[PDB]
Design a protein around this ligand. Structure first.
Ligand SMILES: NC(=O)c1ccc[n+]([C@@H]2O[C@H](COP(=O)([O-])OP(=O)(O)OC[C@H]3O[C@@H](n4cnc5c(N)ncnc54)[C@H](OP(=O)(O)O)[C@@H]3O)[C@@H](O)[C@H]2O)c1
Lengths: 284, 289
């Protein structure tokens, strides 16, 4: 039970704490060496250099701000990476994580990508989940240590996948939550409160998985028949939303973008297809 | 004797009007129908509906008239030439349109001596006649109560208040969420597909995310009603950073950026107007202008 943590922001601090709680020997490094004071008081071993941190252990957790920090601190010590397993937790794009894995492999190290789904306070709780991706044999070799921090959800071999599943979920979260705020602004303009809207907003959100379930097999076939819905009629529905927004004096940017997507789909010949055919507009 | 007359007129026989007329007939109503395209009533006539030739005749047949037309402009188009014959009628308009359109129609109808109930039907034709289905209703409460029994043959009802616009308000704000959130799903799936993963693989994650959203709505609702956006549990600056990673992921996958780029623009406007350290709920102020 021995692990190195490089990067002592809030996440790194939480992780290092939980490891110390469960009896691990924890070696730490940070560019600003004072950030480790509280951990050192709890038994963490602070080392002066990146070299010493890498030497201490096979498993190295990288809780850095972004992937550029990784290159900055490891590139000058590229000769010292053989046999190390670097678990990268920065939030970034799939391609960033892929480029990092390849760079590390070229220097004899192995990479596990992690997409942590909770804030620092979730660390050490089994109801918390982290996406992991990368070589399955490397991941299985360190799974026990990683699961001291959270439950795991291994997504596959591609180092980019842990970040893929994280970012596409955030695409839905932010866009759908903004739609909720937008809808509430219209509601407020017409005299209705968030308390009054609550059960209706909630019921709509909860209904969406049933649509996703319905359309999933069709989307996987590349099929957009107009048997239960037509794009033309979706467009007309969006248009009512845009006019409602305008009448209420609410900012039109968000529904106007939705309307523009529908129009582009109509303008490429999809009037009679399902609205799912708009995936072709996004695909590019 | 208590109870509604078992007699009703339906004007507008698209798929929704056809479903409503069918349900009324099966329930035991005398159903009088009119449609611009008269042949669309053939099946209903075979089951006992009474087709009339003119809109005037359809209005004369009954007190209660259900409209299922494309929108409110259609209503004017057909009713204006028979404005004289609206006196004493109760028109229940189940057409999708904006709140203000419904308000203006309710006044126009009252000026002609008719009464108006706005309805926002929440289900497709197949949901008509099922009690798990709901329709939003609004308008004069006494008029609604007088015809509720008939309206409940079609769906359960959810009366929202006196303002005739409200039934279209609740309907349209739910559709703002539906279309925007479903397009976010398609956008996210396009990224997934570019990266080699399928809708089947995405399904449990898309569904879990969507199903988690009501918990956020519940958490924020009381704060929003106070006009409060403290940054105690989240800050806009950190949300912006999260949106930026979404935009870059999109671009790397070669996926159309219009939708996340508009999300990002909203966040940036909120940063511009001072809300870096407030909750992301502060973006409601950007929507408010
Ligand atoms: N279908 C759905 O799933 C659904 C769900 C909820 C709410 N709604 C709403 O229900 C309403 C009716 O929709 P729908 O699907 O049943 O059919 P629709 O195709 O909108 O047709 C509705 C009716 O309007 C008539 N109409 C259209 N333009 C007209 C004109 N210029 N003059 C005279 N009549 C006119 C049509 O006559 P013809 O038959 O002669 O074309 C038809 O009777 C809409 O507002 C729709 O948004 C629909």
């Amino acid at each position: 039970k021995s692990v190195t943590v490089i990067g002592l922001g809030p996440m790194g601090q939480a992780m290092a704490d939980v490891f110390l709680e469960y009896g691990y020997s924890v070696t730490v490094w940070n560019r600003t060496s004072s950030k480790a004071d509280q951990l050192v008081a709890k038994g963490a071993i602070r080392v002066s250099t990146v070299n010493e941190a890498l030497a201490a252990n096979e498993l190295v957790i990288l809780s850095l701000t972004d992937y550029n920090v990784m290159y900055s601190i490891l590139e000058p010590v590229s000769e010292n990476l053989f046999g190390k397993v670097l678990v990268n937790l920065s939030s970034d794009t799939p391609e960033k994580a892929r480029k990092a894995a390849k760079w590390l492999e070229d220097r004899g190290a192995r990479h596990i990508t992690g997409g942590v789904q909770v804030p620092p306070s979730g660390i050490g709780k089994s109801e918390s989940y982290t996406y992991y991706s990368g070589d399955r044999v490397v991941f299985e070799a360190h799974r026990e240590t990683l699961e001291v921090l959270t439950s795991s959800d291994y997504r596959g071999e591609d180092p980019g996948l842990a970040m893929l599943y994280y970012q596409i979920q955030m695409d839905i979260f932010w866009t759908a939550m903004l739609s909720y705020l937008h809808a509430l602004a219209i509601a407020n303009a017409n005299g209705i409160t968030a308390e009054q809207f609550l059960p209706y907003a909630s019921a709509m959100m909860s209904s969406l998985p049933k649509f996703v379930e319905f359309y999933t097999p069709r989307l996987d076939e590349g099929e957009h028949p107009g048997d239960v819905d037509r794009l033309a009629m979706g467009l007309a529905s969006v248009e009512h939303v845009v006019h409602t927004t305008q009448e209420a004096g609410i900012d039109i940017a968000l529904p106007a973008t939705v309307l523009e997507v529908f129009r582009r789909g109509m303008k490429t010949g999809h009037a009679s297809d399902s609205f799912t055919s708009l995936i072709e507009i996004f695909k590019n």
